[PDB]
């Protein structure tokens, strides 16, 4: 059966995700007591050429460079180039599939250099400053960014205070940004999909359903405490509420414009004018808003409102 194989996959990914996070968080939180010393740094090379080259490569971090960038990293003394390396990392445009590599590299930095985490945090904050008054949203980057700062917290590079606080901040903006126009929906879904388990305490309907139906035991939430998760869950439901309002409105005004085309069908006979390419745009984005609403109701384990 197809349904069982998908559930086994979900279940397998869940555990891979969980085991990795647990392993990385342990190393990162334990980093301070065993960073290397002066003498060790002496034997790595501080050349400006190589360290600068490396900082540049960090602008295009890619999964298939995991080993190559790691190899270079281990030979360089990056003591003086933290701020620059942090800047490359924050600006770099990562695909969904590249974020784990970036986090891996961030962990090698963090585990070697005390200056890394404070710089990374500080530069992320500035970066969300620059965004707030620059106009034309760049949602593609904010999507990944949110996931990225999420992992960096889960993985213990940022402390709960620093990282949770930073994520809460950026989520608030999305909630406030998206009350009529729900333009960041895919950003909230991605965040939920990837990090909602540990940051928001999410347990989606699919996971619940798979667990009961196939007697699969899914990973426990053990990273962020339920108290710290609650605020995040509240925001998501409140967003979801807002999104369901916007779904109802657009249902009415789709069918108040279908049941208006019935008057303009009878009276003065049809004419598939520009209205026959305006309905093809109202019902395009509705279909996508319905898809995203279903997608997020599941992640949050909420029912969909009923659509006559």
Residue numbers in the entry: 121 to 428
What do the authors say?
Nonsense-mediated mRNA decay (NMD) is a eukaryotic mRNA quality control mechanism that recognizes transcripts with premature termination codons (PTC) and promotes their degradation. Human UPF2 (Q9HAU5) is an ∼140 kDa protein containing three conserved MIF4G (Middle portion of eIF4G) domains that are found in a number of proteins involved in RNA metabolism and translation such as the nuclear cap-binding protein CBP80 and eIF4G (eukaryotic initiation factor 4-gamma). UPF2 interacts via its third MIF4G domain with UPF3b and via its C-terminal extremity with UPF1, thus forming the central component of the ternary complex of UPF proteins. Here, we present the atomic resolution crystal structures of the N-terminal (MIF4G-1) and middle (MIF4G-2) domains of UPF2 and a lower resolution crystal structure of the combined UPF2 MIF4G-2/MIF4G-3 domains.
MIF4G-1 helices hA, hB as well as their adjacent loops make extensive contacts with the 10-helix MIF4G core domain, in particular with helices h4, h6 and h8. Notably, Arg137 and Arg141 on hA form hydrogen bonds and salt bridges with Asp317 and Glu271 on the core MIF4G domain, and Leu144 on hA interacts with Val223 and Val275 on h4 and h6, respectively. Pro156, Phe160, Phe161 and Leu164 on hB form a hydrophobic patch interacting with Arg232 and Tyr233 on helix h4. Overall, helices hA, hB and h8i create an extensive network of interactions with the 10 conserved helices of MIF4G-1 core MIF4G domain. A highly conserved motif, 164-LDSSLKKNT-172, is located on the first turn of h1 and the loop immediately preceding it. Mapping of phylogenetically conserved residues on the solvent-accessible surface of MIF4G-1 shows that the motif and a series of downstream conserved charged residues (Lys176, Lys177, Lys179, Asp192, Lys200, Glu204 and Glu211) define a conserved patch at one extremity of the domain. Residues 430–486 at the C-terminus of the MIF4G-1 crystallization construct are disordered in the crystal structure. In addition to the N-terminal extension, MIF4G-1 contains two elongated helices (h9 and h10). The updated quasi-atomic model indicates that (i) the long coiled coil formed by helices h9 and h10 protruding from MIF4G-1 is in close proximity to and could contact the EJC, (ii) the loop between h9 and h10 contacts MIF4G-2 and (iii) the MIF4G-2 domain is positioned close to the Y14 subunit of the EJC likely forming a contact.
